[PDB]
Amino acid sequence: GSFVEMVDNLRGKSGQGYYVEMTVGSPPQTLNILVDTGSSNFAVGAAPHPFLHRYYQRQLSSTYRDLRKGVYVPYTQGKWEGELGTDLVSIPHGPNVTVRANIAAITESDKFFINGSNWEGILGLAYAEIARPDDSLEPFFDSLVKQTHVPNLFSLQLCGAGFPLNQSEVLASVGGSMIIGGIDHSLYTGSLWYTPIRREWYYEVIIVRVEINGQDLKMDCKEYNYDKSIVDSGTTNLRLPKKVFEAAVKSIKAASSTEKFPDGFWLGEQLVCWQAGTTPWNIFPVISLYLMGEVTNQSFRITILPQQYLRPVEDSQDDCYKFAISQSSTGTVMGAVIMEGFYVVFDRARKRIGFAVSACHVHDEFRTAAVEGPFVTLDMEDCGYNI
Ligand SMILES: CCOc1nc(N2C[C@H]3C(=O)N(C)C(=N)N[C@@]3(c3ccc(C#N)s3)C2)nc(C)c1F
Numbered sequence: 458g459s460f461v462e463m464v465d466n467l468r469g470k471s472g473q474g475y476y477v478e479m480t481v482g483s484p485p486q487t488l489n490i491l492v493d494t495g496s497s498n499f500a501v502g503a504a505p506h507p508f509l510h511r512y513y514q515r516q517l518s519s520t521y522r523d524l525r526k527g528v529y530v531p532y533t534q535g536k537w538e539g540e541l542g543t544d545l546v547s548i549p550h551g552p553n554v555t556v557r558a559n560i561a562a563i564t565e566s567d568k569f570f571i572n573g574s575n576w577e578g579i580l581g582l583a584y585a586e587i588a589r590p591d592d593s594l595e596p597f598f599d600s601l602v603k604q605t606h607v608p609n610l611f612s613l614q615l616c617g618a619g620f621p622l623n624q625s626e627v628l629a630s631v632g633g634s635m636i637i638g639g640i641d642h643s644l645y646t647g648s649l650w651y652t653p654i655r656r657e658w659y660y661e662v663i664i665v666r667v668e669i670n671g672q673d674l675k676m677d678c679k680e681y682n683y684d685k686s687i688v689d690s691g692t693t694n695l696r697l698p699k700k701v702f703e704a705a706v707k708s709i710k711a712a713s714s715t716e717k718f719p720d721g722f723w724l725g726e727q728l729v730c731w732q733a734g735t736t737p738w739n740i741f742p743v744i745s746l747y748l749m750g751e752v753t754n755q756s757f758r759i760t761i762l763p764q765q766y767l768r769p770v771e772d773s774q775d776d777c778y779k780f781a782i783s784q785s786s787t788g789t790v791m792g793a794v795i796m797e798g799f800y801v802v803f804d805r806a807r808k809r810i811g812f813a814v815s816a817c818h819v820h821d822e823f824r825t826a827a828v829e830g831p832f833v834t835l836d837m838e839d840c841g842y843n844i
Contacts, residue, residue: 460641466550467633471793476576482518491579495689497588499597501578503562508570535568554605586658607638609806614644617797619819621771645800645813650757652748654808659687663749669708670742678840685788692792696785712742730775749837757830761798764819798826
């Protein structure tokens with residue numbers, strides 16, 4: 458329905474992440490927490506760091522409980538180490554409840570805290586299977602549902618500004634909404650279409666067809682989900698498996714061939730700039746991803762514009778962007794630049810993910826993002842990867 462207390466509770470941008478305010482401990486300690494559907498731990502800075510202006514001070518919380526257990530989390534681009542404990546946690550612009558949750562108090566980290574991101578921790582919203590050190594460490598959302606009457610569902614509206622925001626603007630701007638326990642109908646237009654959650658670990662989905670400006674990429678659909686396809690608010694880009702990325706970039710280059718861009722642009726490293734207001738959106742194609750539907754032999758599609766996959770960056774008065782589609786060796790990742798086009802419903806109770814056109818997606822007068830269906834699609838189970 459309508460969840461006015463949670464609408465507009467996020468801040469941030471696709472490159473540095475979107476965060477929500479939370480409180481930990483007694484008396485409450487306020488922290489800004491990255492919303493991450495790609496992990497399953499609630500972890501906060503708990504020791505001084507050059508990039509943190511605040512951190513969780515366990516010795517100041519009367520409700521802190523030490524679990525006497527460490528946690529070591531090395532991942533591809535970064536790492537953190539911490540100490541496990543529990544404490545009382547609330548979301549000020551959330552459900553009006555306080556829960557006793559696991560907290561990994563980060564004591565040492567490497568390339569984890571981003572200089573100027575304004576967040577001091579991460580809220581992993583995925584399932585216990587991928588929690589560290591193991592699946593016995595109950596994730597925050599699991600604790601919230603178990604301890605309260607909050608429905609087992611959350612929804613995210615990530616709002617890209619469509620232009621760069623400076624330090625002051627990003628602190629003053631509304632970055633979106635995280636609706637805990639419901640769906641807010643003001644955040645989207647048109648209908649919600651649902652795709653099954655294939656397995657509960659990451660938010661895993663199955664892509665069944667890919668088009669670039671209506672042209673079928675024509676790859677065996679297993680390639681699109683090799684070795685998985687996930688929905689991840691903690692990733693900036695749309696990341697595609699190597700072979701899919703190679704085919705997609707060739708097609709996007711062919712569609713936009715009236716302008717030549719350097720190799721560094723297509724590699725997502727180099728910015729491209731145009732005179733203020735002259736970005737040639739129309740030369741860039743739309744991209745549609747078809748997802749397995751809830752009905753047998755039915756699919757639907759989500760369509761994004763270059764306003765989603767060209768990420769605004771500061772250079773001058775030029776309008777500059779980076780290409781936000783990149784290669785992956787760990788499957789497809791529908792990151793923030795996909796999520797900015799849509800209101801995304803993580804319906805854990807019904808093991809499904811819903812998509813609708815976002816009320817805050819960036820577009821022009823000629824084209825809009827879309828969520829459409831149904832389409833007849835056969836052998837969709839064959840699109841999923843095994844082993
Ligand atoms: C395989 C590692 O499993 C785990 N992975 C993770 N994460 C991997 C990181 C990552 O690379 N992506 C993309 C992501 N979605 N989340 C992480 C981010 C770090 C900084 C971000 C920003 N901005 S987002 C957190 N945490 C735990 C606790 C794991 F167990």
